Amino acid sequence: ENHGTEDELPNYCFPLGGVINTETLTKVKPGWEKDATEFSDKNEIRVGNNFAMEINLNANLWRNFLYSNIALYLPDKLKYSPSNVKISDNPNTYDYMNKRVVAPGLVDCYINLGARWSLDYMDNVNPFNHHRNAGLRYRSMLLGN
Amino acid sequence: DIRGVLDRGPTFKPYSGTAYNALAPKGAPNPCEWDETHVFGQAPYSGINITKEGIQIGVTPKYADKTFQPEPQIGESQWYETEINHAAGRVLKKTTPMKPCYGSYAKPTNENGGQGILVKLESQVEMQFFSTTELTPKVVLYSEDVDIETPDTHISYMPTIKEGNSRELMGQQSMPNRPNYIAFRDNFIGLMYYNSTGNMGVLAGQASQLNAVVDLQDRNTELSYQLLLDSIGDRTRYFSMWNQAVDSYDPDVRIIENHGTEDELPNYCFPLGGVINTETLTKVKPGWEKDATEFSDKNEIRVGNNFAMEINLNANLWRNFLYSNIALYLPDKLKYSPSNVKISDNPNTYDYMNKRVVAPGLVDCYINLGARWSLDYMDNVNPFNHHRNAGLRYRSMLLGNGRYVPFHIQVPQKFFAIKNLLLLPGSYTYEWNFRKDVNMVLQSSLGNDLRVDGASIKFDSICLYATFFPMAHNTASTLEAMLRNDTNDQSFNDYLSAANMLYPIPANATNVPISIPSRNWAAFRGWAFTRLKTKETPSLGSGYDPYYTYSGSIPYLDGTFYLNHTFKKVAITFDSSVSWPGNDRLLTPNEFEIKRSVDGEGYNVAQCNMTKDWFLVQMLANYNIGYQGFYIPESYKDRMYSFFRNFQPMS
Amino acid sequence: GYNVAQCNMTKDWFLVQMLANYNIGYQGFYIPESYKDRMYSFFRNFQPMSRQVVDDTKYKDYQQVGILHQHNNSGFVGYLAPTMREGQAYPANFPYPLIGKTAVDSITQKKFLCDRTLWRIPFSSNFMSMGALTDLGQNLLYANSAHALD
Amino acid sequence: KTAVDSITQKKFLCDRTLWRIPFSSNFMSMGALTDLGQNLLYANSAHALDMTFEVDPMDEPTLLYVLFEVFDVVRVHRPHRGVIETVYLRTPFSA
Amino acid sequence: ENHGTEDELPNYCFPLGGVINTETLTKVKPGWEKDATEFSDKNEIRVGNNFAMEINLNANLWRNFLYSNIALYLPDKLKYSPSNVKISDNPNTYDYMNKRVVAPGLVDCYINLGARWSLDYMDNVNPFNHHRNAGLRYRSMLLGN
Amino acid sequence: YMPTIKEGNSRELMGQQSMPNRPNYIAFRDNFIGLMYYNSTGNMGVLAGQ
């Protein structure tokens, strides 16, 4: 039910000390004259806003959910073998099904936006062979870890 | 109907995290000064010109009001820097406490929002000018002093002991105080005296003055009321008018289903302008030649990818959830006192229970990974004394969010002998007693002693309400006359209908024998037992307990038992010579074996250590299931307090 | 003295509503059966709430401040608009604390919400639902003559 | 591939409940007044009962809560106006 | 039911390579003497902790939820027109209701903290004219996107 | 946030910021309420023998 994400506000990261790029200024007094026997010549002053970077959160959470629960269960005909690594030739081996790489662009945060519509590839595969099967997960944890 | 005024004390804090400067980094300090004299600050505001009268904000020139300007929210608006030529800001004088920005609050002192301190009553802000190292000033700092407080946060790491604002004091960090809800107990348990001879409640005819209510020391009523309420209704709903909100807990915190996190993709954060480290290049044209009358010599071009850093989001969310809901509730023997800070010696004081520090490594995002397994330390502590108890949280929010709450509540009658009595015309004397100990009538989410934390309560007015059915007089006379026949006497029975015996168990003891002297056993119905902590149980029938210093949930009253999983064997015999039930009914023909170790795996069941015979007995006792194959009972037959509902196998 | 359910609803009105919907109240209030209180019933959508606010009359140091001057998370949140962050770090000046050692004197406000429902006033002697054709409807007083209602 | 040899641990949790041991021949709930309670063996004479529990220990004093559920019945009679009298009976363990 | 957020631990962000600002040092051996025919003079060593900043996550998620679901549905008397942009005069058009700006400070992560209390303004606005109305959302996706 | 009102690509125009438009679902009413005329004398529905 891809109804998008709520990302009206921007979220930021700020340095541990708050400011990291500050200049050193000297104190002067009234025509203006220098000062001594007071505040030292080494004063950490930051002009303007503090340095910070921004990351969208709801969009990132949506992307992680989609890739981990759908994009990894596409039919093998859509995936492709990786490069410079070994991979088992038998398609039923766990090694084969684990090392096949899927382009995230196939299913992203904008696929069929605003529509309640399962994928045209996902409907011909077993949905119960999924790691979110609560019954299967519960039975597995019953034996142990 | 009771009306009064309540004071919940300074311990009350009905929310996690803080309220002031929540988004701030936990180590970021407010701009301030100190002596060794050095100043550390930041001026965001931009003006036009700087003179001896301060920054000029507009027009003849106008200068900022030192009382409240420059405001600390106004700053720039474009991400790219523009080489501000005249800046202003605010700093704190050296005569103020040195605190981090996170959680720091200072009350205002004027309608414009200023926070300066007024003395004889005018403020005393000062002007400070700073210029580059080689003549006009460049920035102006508005130094002042405020009554800065930390209402809900405490220092988590104090670098040194020496008091006073010094350079080393910049490194302190703070984290919010633990949440602690305080409210009335479920169904107003404890406000009404029960099963106490000294505080006997009386209901008698006006003329006879002979008490019609006689209670017993061993009889339990509030627990009986709780069980009765569950059987005849549903407890998952909330009724505010009776303060009806059953205590519970999140199934996740009690039993962690740690199946890891989904973090296949990397999540990144990017600079505000997209690129920050870019070089300047000139434009050339075809052998190549320079160009003029065109694109300037200064062009911002960035080669390669843009600067960025990454976060594992799901892992971080998992860590925060675990530490805040589990690691803070470990037994105190695992924690350790912090350093360079004061802490109350009393283990029951909220200050002590708040300042003890827990290493996050004890419970991290990798503990028992892939297994549905509760911790070996969490299972011996009360799970209902947790800030996620929805019933407790709902009741706390009913009163309000302040510490001084005038309340007005309604209390029902719980004694089984009169709670359904149908009276007849006449005059009767109705008299009862009510408690005042805050440790009993109130309930906290941490169980800290409230007698020492200053919580108080005072009742002003008490009134009794009763509603009569507007029913016809003629048939009322017939009904009351017909009810005055000895053959039609009303009768009631207690729902629990049990005699309660408490037997001490010494610490670290394993075997506890009890004995009952010879007596008639006609009409006996059976046993029902559990285990309680003497720390969490008040004395029976005492008017006031001077040694009861626990304000958490009381399993003996509200029926929230959590120690049933600590039984191994039960042996029952009459006359000390004939065993019961005998007749080799069970696999062990002498005793009930609740659970065994791996040695007796041949008798385990349900993929646990609980033996088959005990499991069969419990199923038969609750739903009469087992003689024709086990299966899940009907949902309407296993209520909230039933056995099969709360049975959880783990490995 | 006449409120109920820890809100500002009067006792008599609350009793009438319970009687009108589920005939509950003459033998003690309790949770009605789930099948009896449907999605539009009164009790399903009854929500009593309360809160405390700073007593501007008793607090000696009260200073009413406007929206244009409250600074919380200053230097980390845009000013009066969902835009880029600006400003500088500074101790907050809003809202007034209501807990802890330095809590201020406060008053209380109580109110309630009730959606997807209609206030019902049955035309019966005891406000009970003993049939579609109520007893007062069959009373001869209104059966013969006419009356003007305001 | 590099997993290490391991042992297993099993346990269980049971909250908000009491261990129940009915005093009936087949542990069935066939009525409030159980058959064994009506047996003549316990109806005529008296018996001294002792019973031992074996529990795993912890490091703080604890209490063993035992409930001998019995019949607790009160009958209320009033002959005239404004006079109320009651009778109590808790059998066994009567005061 | 504003019961605050759980933010006891700080959540950080780290550079892609782990370290960015490292020095170049030479290897010496025992008095001490320089070395050759071994580790080159160009060695990337970082002293002290790695550079990183941090984010409060639960607080940010709470703010986004509040602004997107409440602050945008305040009565128009509390909002104010933006600047330097064109906005339709008719108060019923989508353009008008989309371009009015609301100061986030009206409803922030600290409004009525710890109290289960609806706002004094939302009690007079229709709660069913909300984008989280499941019935309305379901019927919309039924037609299509 | 528009920095300046003057049109044309200028340096000051770097600083504009965007936020998504408010969501607005449009669909038929529940149970197709309002599609058929009810309780209107002018648009009276009729069902009669032939």
Author numbering:
A (entry chain B): 1401 to 1430, 1437 to 1551
B (entry chain C): 2101 to 2136, 2165 to 2187, 2191 to 2251, 2257 to 2270, 2279 to 2430, 2437 to 2801
C (entry chain A): 752 to 901
D (entry chain C): 2852 to 2946
E (entry chain A): 401 to 430, 437 to 551
F (entry chain A): 301 to 350
Could you share sentences copied from the article?
Hexon is a trimeric, barrel-shaped protein that represents the main building block of the virus capsid. Adenoviruses are non-enveloped viruses with a capsid of icosahedral symmetry that encapsulates a double-stranded DNA genome. In this model, human lactoferrin (hLF), an innate immune protein, aids the viral uptake into epithelial cells by mediating interactions between the major capsid protein, hexon, and yet unknown host cellular receptor(s).
To our knowledge, this is the highest resolution structure of HAdV-C5 hexon determined by cryo-EM. Due to the high stability of the trimer, the resolution is relatively uniform across the whole structure and thus it could be modeled unambiguously with a high average cross-correlation of 0.736. Throughout the length of the hexon, the protomers are in close contact forming large interfaces in addition to intertwined regions at the “turrets” and the base. Significantly lower resolution is observed only for the hypervariable loop regions, the “turrets” at the top of the molecule which are largely disordered and could not be built due to a lack of traceable density in the final reconstruction. The RMSD between both structures is 0.9 Å, indicating high overall similarity.
